[PDB]
């Protein structure tokens, strides 16, 4: 069976097959239990603060159609649309909170100083020391300064900083409370390969609390960081508490050895780090945890990172950060919902497997015009066999994301190269928008004509791996509909290849940690969670409120 | 002109579409006040209103060899008329307007939606278009729709009487009749009197005049062609662009 | 010369004026009227003498709706604009015989500022124009009326506005064509942050004129951008001389052949003939009753291609006398061409790319807006490399006033002042003298 | 000439070269050795092409830590430097024996590149320097070795890195001493935008030499950013020649009669009974036992106090062989000169100004770093227009090696490839003796 033809059967009475149904007699919002939810809070709203709010009767009435549910891909949970709305998803917005108040920071530079410019020994016993100071002082309380007033430390107890080194016996001598174990996280493959990368660097993970990230913006998570790690640096080793030395530890943390989740935007788009058009879709694809937990099911990972992408590059960036509204709950649902790119994704697994096998076909045009085109007919062949399928994914911005998506994945499962899957990308959809003589919604396919011939490039703004490209790439930096199956298609050719990671090793391991309050291993089953209104997300104010 | 590839209806129907000598079926008789009361922007007999003085009231040669449209030369406004297409063998699809909208007309602004498809130009030279784009095979009133918003339906299941969904409900089906009646104009105002569309296509005549390639009718793969065509464009942007 | 196509060129009444000229002798690298169009650009200055009286005499500096309630100051600069402007001069020019220019306008309520090439030639960028003419009026000003130490901060502010406090000169009673580098949206895209407003309003709503000089922009940005290098310098200089530079007439014969009749789908059949006609393309494979065309220059197809979509826009939004349109042209006449022949649409796809977003963010909510508001350095218009903005030039030209942001709403200042530079006007007649000048030097 | 006033210039060793030279042969806007330094800095590119084939091989490119397993390339390109900067050069030049300029330095492993000044007479800024050295040499390298379609995007990826994702040239393998435009502080600010640790490094840690090419730059930002037109021009070139170009042999003098024993405050007092000899100050008032000075050209006790400032730094920082003290001694020396005398300090306090924070941004926890990552284009170091940035540049050039990030961490590409140019590692030379050239001139 198709894997979407349970969700089918539980949005309609109708057989999924049929073409005929009934509309007009479903009583408009009063069908949904989540409809006449919001139509009573606005009442209640209005009524409080004295102004109109949410009303029914305002516009075109909503549910002449089955206002319908929609199944968490690779989950048994069926939620309306409304509970994926970001605003009304507390594990949505924690996904990026996660992210957002995260940064990288290296200690090597930092020991150099210590054991060079001020003449003092580092070892696992001072770094445990240090960083037994800086987890202290990184929420928000003093070490040095004589009557400092602090931070409520149950406000702010999701901050703390962790490290990793891929030198084991260098790990193993640090107070493991403080250490992302990479052999008890990765698959030994993965480990082995990671370690590697690392070498005998110390890296420290450091996160912000949620509240203050909420308070203020991404580019404050870099500054945070560099600030507490300088003061528990002053403490830890001994230094006057604000000599020249000491600079060089700011200089260290702020720009030297620093890794920021997301780079700056230019001005149009003007925005600080670590926000989401500054994240590249390879740092997406390795935040999401599934490449270390379904490494055997590369149609699992790579989705798994699509599901990421498109929540936060779709609902968040585009639909917020850069529009608002209702915004693009269901622009981004098509792409984890139903079970629905999950048939199409595992049609091109197996047809790549059984005609080429993972990662052996030749990286050429030839195996994109074969496998995106193969892929592309099966994807847009089950909306012409399945009616409900196609009333499900109504608007074709949803279609040709879910096709393409599908049809670059599997290409680059054949090549083992994300830049000809990205080539399989717009092959799909050319080709999808002849066969329907429709495509997207009015400027969808701005990226989708200039692709081709960007895909190869080499010039100045063009040319760049999928890997390198993010939501600044100056064609992706529009639409939605692209941008989270972008990060699925740089995740396909390394989790066919069994690679760790994707575009940065230290990124990986910075999320293979139990101490986040979202479940990067499991973002689907997150996402349905908060939707059933069960996540417990940090930075809330309700200890500092009345009862 | 060649205008598209392709050996099969679907192929035909779109290079019909699009050739401006190719006399475009007429199937239905609508008067021109209820074109412009389909339209919804004046009323029948109302002046038309001027977004600039005319034309006759600087040196360029481009000017001077361009004709310009009489609606240009009064000054009317931009208006628009939009349709909805069924992906159930709709006899026009959204690409395939715009198309043959820019090969048959004249100071046309077409746009391309999965959902909807619109051209605006100035508004007494719309109202002449918009006769042939509802008399003719353009438009069918069960698997079309004029809508000027809420246009949700292109995608969706048909209704008992194989009518497409439509959330204002612009186009009434009559059982007794089995004609099509507009109650409303396409942003959903409704009409003093309704405007007779006539019968819907049988299902037989629409596979024989749709657009849009189905696997219940002629896929998109077995117009190896078409598809062939399609591959050569995505090879030759590609090698262009790095070279 | 590293390329042996020679074009012949016409001026902006389809007349001939020199033949076989090589094709680098358009270039911007090399054509002498092209260098003088750039760094008039760089150098000019607006200054609206009577927005700073009247920010002055009200208080009203720093943004939109600002006022400083007991700041205001009662000068008399438009009356005093002789002297005001003569002071200026004096601290903006070098020596007394650079090219230094100072003239006003509008009876002293403007002035038309060049600030001489001397100080260009030892400045990194191009901000010394309104630095340095901001910075001498105001200067002028409180010399001329002895204003105090402490009234002075008033007069910059009516001047350059709230910066530095914005990062651009937010409130600034002057005007010049390009942003602040900051707003580039990439390095070597200052000559593209040009509106297309801009370009009509100082030429005046000629069409080749504007057609013409968005053409010599957009490709002459191309090559600081370092797209107009090696591989691809002469798919950009054969696009700017037929899409740009009406070479051959092509431009000019499309648009006359289907000016009274034709559509966009009758001129890209017009274009197929005069390109198959001129060996540019052939027939390289036959299908089921289907041609399908190759070449052996995809260089030379782009550019007939591209002349080919300029003359749709003209002949398209020219009959509307509406500009909106051209984003459906840039769109539909690629999207067309490539069924019709099976060869790419202009710059592979990028234009109809471009126009797709063109055609969205001017025909929507979440952004973007008329016509004339778009440039080389928007995020929505930034992508083709210099073949669409010429043909939204060519249509914002022909726009009989249908807009509410045309240029005369947001490109006042520019349309009174940079209208007076006859190179800028008339940029079509100065680059093919200099084309006929060097032909035998390249 | 617009000044009277004339300057006795010398070299870096205390000789005197030409005598009674006009003031503005030493400006920005005459000097033809300035505009060489300001052209040759625009123009100028390092590639290091030993880099790149690394980050081919191991697909290491896009930002730190940053890798893409099964994308590596091995390619031997430092084998074939020869014929890719051969190519490289036929697609950077614009004709034959123009001023393009490619040499292959550390047998291939680094290139220096300089682009033809035509590039930049029709561009808007500096930009077209890396963009087209880089596309030059992405070309230049998939030709050599017929990289395919499907891998030439790692050679740009290696050469250029993450652009136009980020904004910058993130893990480019190219350098250049000027950043992007959008990093500018404010219009005017790219000549600023050097860090110090860039001009040390290619002055290969001379004091001279470093203290007049920092003044170059500083004093002729201030000009692009309009703070030395009018009023307040002849203020930047009385600090240029004093402070940056050793005029009349004060700076020189200063840290003579000083080196052996002297601290900032026995230059203060030197510097005062100089001003006092040479009528630049006198005695205005008189307290208790406390003489208050006064002046009738603030512009010249400026430049005098300028010169004391400067050579304050040399014997302070040079007696510690340490550059951090700079902090201090462009502090106190301000603070202490004001109450020795009743006049102003340098730049009127704005040197004092700059001091502060940057002491506290070099000895605390809140940002900055050492002496040698400043610039005029740091929030910490912008704020004197050009009297402070020089002294750094000289503190730093003292600096026997007790910084971190000294130019050898942060400018190794720069101090390998930048000080082959012999105007930028010696500018002191050039500018003396193209003043002396123009001297007849002004
Ligand atoms: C007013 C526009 C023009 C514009 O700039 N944005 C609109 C409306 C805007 C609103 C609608 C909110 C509301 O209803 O009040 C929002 C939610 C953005 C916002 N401001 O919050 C949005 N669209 Ni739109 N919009 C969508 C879509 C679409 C599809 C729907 C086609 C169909 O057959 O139903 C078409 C484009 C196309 O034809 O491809 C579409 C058009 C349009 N989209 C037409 C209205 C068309 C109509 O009259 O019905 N959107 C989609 O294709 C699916 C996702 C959906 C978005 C909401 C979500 O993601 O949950 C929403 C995204
Ligand atoms: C284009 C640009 O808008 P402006 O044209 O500059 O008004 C930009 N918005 C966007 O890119 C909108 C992206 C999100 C909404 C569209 C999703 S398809 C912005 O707001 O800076
Ligand atoms: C100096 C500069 O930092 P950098 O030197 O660029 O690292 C700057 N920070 C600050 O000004 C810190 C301000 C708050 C801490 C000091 C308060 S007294 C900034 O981040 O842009
Ligand atoms: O109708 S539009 O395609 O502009 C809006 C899409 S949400
Ligand atoms: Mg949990
Ligand atoms: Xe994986
Ligand atoms: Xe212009
Ligand atoms: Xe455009
Ligand atoms: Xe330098
Ligand atoms: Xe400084």
Redesign the interface.
């Given at each position: 069976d198709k894997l979407f033809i349970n969700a089918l059967k539980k949005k309609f009475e109708e057989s999924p097959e049929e073409k005929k149904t009934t509309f007009y007699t479903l009583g408009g919002w009063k069908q949904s239990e989540r409809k006449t939810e919001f139509v009573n809070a606005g009442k209640e709203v209005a009524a409080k603060r004295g102004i109109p709010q949410y009303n029914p009767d305002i516009g075109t009435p909503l549910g002449q159609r089955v206002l319908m549910p929609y199944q968490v891909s690779t989950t048994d949970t069926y939620v309306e649309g409304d509970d994926l709305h970001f605003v009304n998803n507390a594990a949505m917005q924690q996904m990026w909170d996660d992210i957002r108040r995260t940064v990288i920071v290296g200690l090597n530079h930092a020991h150099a100083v210590i054991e060079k410019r001020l003449g003092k020994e580092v070892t696992p016993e001072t770094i445990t020391h240090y960083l037994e100071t800086v987890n202290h002082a990184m929420p928000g309380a003093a070490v040095v300064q004589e009557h400092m007033v602090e931070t409520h430390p149950a406000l702010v107890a999701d901050s703390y900083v962790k490290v990793f080194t891929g030198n084991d016996e260098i790990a193993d001598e640090i107070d493991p409370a403080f250490v992302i174990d990479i052999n008890k996280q990765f698959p030994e493959d993965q480990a082995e390969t990671l370690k590697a990368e690392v070498g005998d660097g110390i890296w420290q993970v450091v996160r912000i609390p949620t509240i203050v990230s909420r308070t203020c913006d991404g580019a404050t998570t870099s500054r945070w960081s560099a600030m507490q790690i300088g003061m528990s640096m002053i403490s830890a080793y001994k230094q006057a508490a604000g000599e020249a030395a000491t600079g060089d530890f700011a200089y260290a943390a702020k720009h030297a050895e620093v890794i920021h989740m997301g780079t700056y935007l230019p001005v149009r788009r003007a925005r600080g780090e670590n926000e989401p058009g500054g994240v590249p879709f390879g740092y997406l694809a390795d935040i999401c945890q599934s490449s270390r937990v379904n490494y055997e099911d590369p149609v699992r990972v790579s989705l798994d990172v699509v599901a990421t992408g498109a929540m936060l590059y779709d609902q968040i960036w585009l639909g917020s950060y850069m529009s608002g509204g209702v915004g693009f709950t269901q622009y981004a649902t098509a792409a984890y919902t139903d079970n629905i790119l999950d048939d199409f994704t595992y049609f091109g697994k197996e047809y790549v497997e059984d005609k080429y096998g993972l990662c052996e076909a030749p990286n050429n045009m030839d195996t994109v015009l074969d496998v995106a085109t193969e892929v592309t007919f099966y994807g847009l062949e089950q909306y012409e066999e399945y009616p409900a399928l196609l009333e499900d994914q109504f608007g074709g911005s949803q279609r040709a994301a879910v096709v393409a998506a599908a049809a670059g994945c599997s290409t680059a499962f054949a090549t083992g190269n994300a830049q000809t899957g990205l080539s399989g990308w717009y092959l799909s959809m050319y080709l999808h928008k002849e066969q329907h003589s429709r495509l997207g919604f009015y400027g969808y396919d701005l990226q989708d004509q200039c692709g081709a011939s960007n895909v190869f490039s080499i010039r100045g703004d063009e040319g760049l791996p999928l890997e390198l490209r993010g939501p600044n790439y100056p064609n992706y930096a529009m639409n939605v509909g692209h941008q989270g199956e972008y990060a699925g298609i740089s995740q396909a050719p390394h989790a066919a290849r069994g690679d760790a990671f994707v575009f940065n090793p230290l990124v990986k391991i910075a999320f293979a940690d139990d101490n986040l309050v979202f479940d990067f291993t499991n973002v689907r089953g997150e996402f349905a969670k908060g939707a059933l209104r069960e996540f417990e997300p940090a930075g809330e104010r309700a200890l500092i409120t009345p009862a | 002109?060649?205008?598209?590839?392709?050996?099969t209806k679907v192929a035909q129907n779109?290079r019909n579409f699009?050739n401006?000598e190719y006399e475009l079926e007429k199937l239905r008789e609508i008067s021109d006040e209820d074109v412009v009361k389909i339209l919804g922007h004046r009323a029948p007999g109302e002046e038309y209103p001027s977004?600039?003085?005319p034309?006759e009231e600087?040196?360029?040669?481009?000017?001077e060899?361009?004709?310009?449209?009489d609606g240009?030369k009064a000054?009317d406004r931009?208006r628009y008329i939009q349709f909805t297409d069924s992906?159930?063998f709709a006899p026009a699809?959204?690409?395939?307007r715009?198309?043959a909208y820019?090969?048959?007309?004249?100071?046309?602004?077409?746009?391309?939606?999965?959902?909807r498809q619109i051209i605006?130009?100035?508004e007494r030279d719309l109202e002449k278009i918009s006769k042939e784009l509802l008399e003719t095979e353009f438009f069918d009133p069960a698997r079309s729709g004029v809508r000027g918003?809420?246009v949700?339906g292109?995608?969706?299941?048909?209704?008992?009487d194989?009518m497409m969904?439509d959330?204002?409900?612009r186009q009434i089906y009559n059982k007794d009749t089995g004609r099509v009646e507009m109650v409303k104009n396409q942003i959903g105002d409704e009409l003093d009197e309704p405007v007779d569309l006539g019968e819907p296509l049988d299902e037989e005549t629409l596979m024989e005049k749709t657009?849009?390639?189905?696997?219940?009718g002629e896929?998109?793969?077995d117009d190896v062609?078409?598809?062939?065509?399609?591959?050569?464009?995505?090879?030759?942007?590609?090698?262009?662009?790095?070279? | 010369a590293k390329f042996e196509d020679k074009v012949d060129l016409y001026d902006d009444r389809g007349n001939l004026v020199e033949e076989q000229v090589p094709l680098e002798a358009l270039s911007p690298l090399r054509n002498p009227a092209i260098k003088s169009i750039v760094q008039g650009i760089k150098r000019t200055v607006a200054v609206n003498l009577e927005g700073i009286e009247n920010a002055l005499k009200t208080a009203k500096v720093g943004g939109p709706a600002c006022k400083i309630m007991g700041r205001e100051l009662d000068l008399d600069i438009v009356g005093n604009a002789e002297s005001i402007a003569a002071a200026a001069k004096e601290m903006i020019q070098v020596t007394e015989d650079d090219d230094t220019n100072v003239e006003l306008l509008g009876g002293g309520k403007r002035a038309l500022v060049q600030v001489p090439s001397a100080r260009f030639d030892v400045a990194a960028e191009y901000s010394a124009a309104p630095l340095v003419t901001a910075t001498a009026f105001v200067q002028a000003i409180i010399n001329e009326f002895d204003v105090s130490m402490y009234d002075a901060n008033m007069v910059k502010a009516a001047v350059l506005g709230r910066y530095p406090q914005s990062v651009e000169y937010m409130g600034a009673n002057i005007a010049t064509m390009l942003d602040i580098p900051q707003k580039l949206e990439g390095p070597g895209y200052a000559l593209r942050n040009i509106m297309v407003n801009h370009v009509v309003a100082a030429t005046l709503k000629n069409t080749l004129q504007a057609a013409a000089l968005s053409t010599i922009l957009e490709q002459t940005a191309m090559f600081e951008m370092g797209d107009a290098v090696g591989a691809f310098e002469r798919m950009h200089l054969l696009g700017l001389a037929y899409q740009g530079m009406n070479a051959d007439n092509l431009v000019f014969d499309l648009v006359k052949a289907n000016g009274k009749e034709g559509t966009v789908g009758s001129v890209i059949a017009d274009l197929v003939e005069r390109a198959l006609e001129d060996g540019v393309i052939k027939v390289e494979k036959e299908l089921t009753d289907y041609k399908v065309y190759g070449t052996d220059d995809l260089a030379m197809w782009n550019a007939y291609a591209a002349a080919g979509l300029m003359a749709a826009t003209m002949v398209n939004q020219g009959a509307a006398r509406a500009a909106q349109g051209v984003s459906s042209t840039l769109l539909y006449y690629n999207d067309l061409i490539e069924f019709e022949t099976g060869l790419p649409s202009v710059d592979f796809g990028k234009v109809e790319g471009t126009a797709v977003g063109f055609s969205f963010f001017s025909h929507s909510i979440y952004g973007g807006g008329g016509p004339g508001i778009f440039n080389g350095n928007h995020i929505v218009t930034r992508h083709s490399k210099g073949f669409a903005i010429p043909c939204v030039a060519a249509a914002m030209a022909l726009d009989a006033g249908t807009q509410m942001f045309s240029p005369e709403a947001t490109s006042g200042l520019i349309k009174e002042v940079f209208s007076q530079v006859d190179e800028f006007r008339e940029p079509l007649k100065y680059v093919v003298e200099a084309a006929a000048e060097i032909k035998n030097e390249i």
């Open positions: - | 002109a060649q205008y598209y590839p392709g050996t779109r699009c401006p977004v600039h003085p034309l600087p040196e360029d040669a481009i000017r060899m361009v004709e310009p449209i240009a000054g931009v992906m159930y699809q959204p690409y395939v715009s198309r820019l090969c048959r007309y004249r100071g046309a602004d077409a746009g391309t939606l999965s959902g605006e130009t100035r918003k809420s949700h292109h995608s969706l299941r048909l209704d008992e194989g969904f959330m204002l409900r657009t849009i390639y189905r696997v219940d896929a998109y793969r062609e078409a598809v062939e065509i399609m591959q050569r464009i995505h090879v030759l942007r590609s090698q262009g662009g790095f070279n | -």
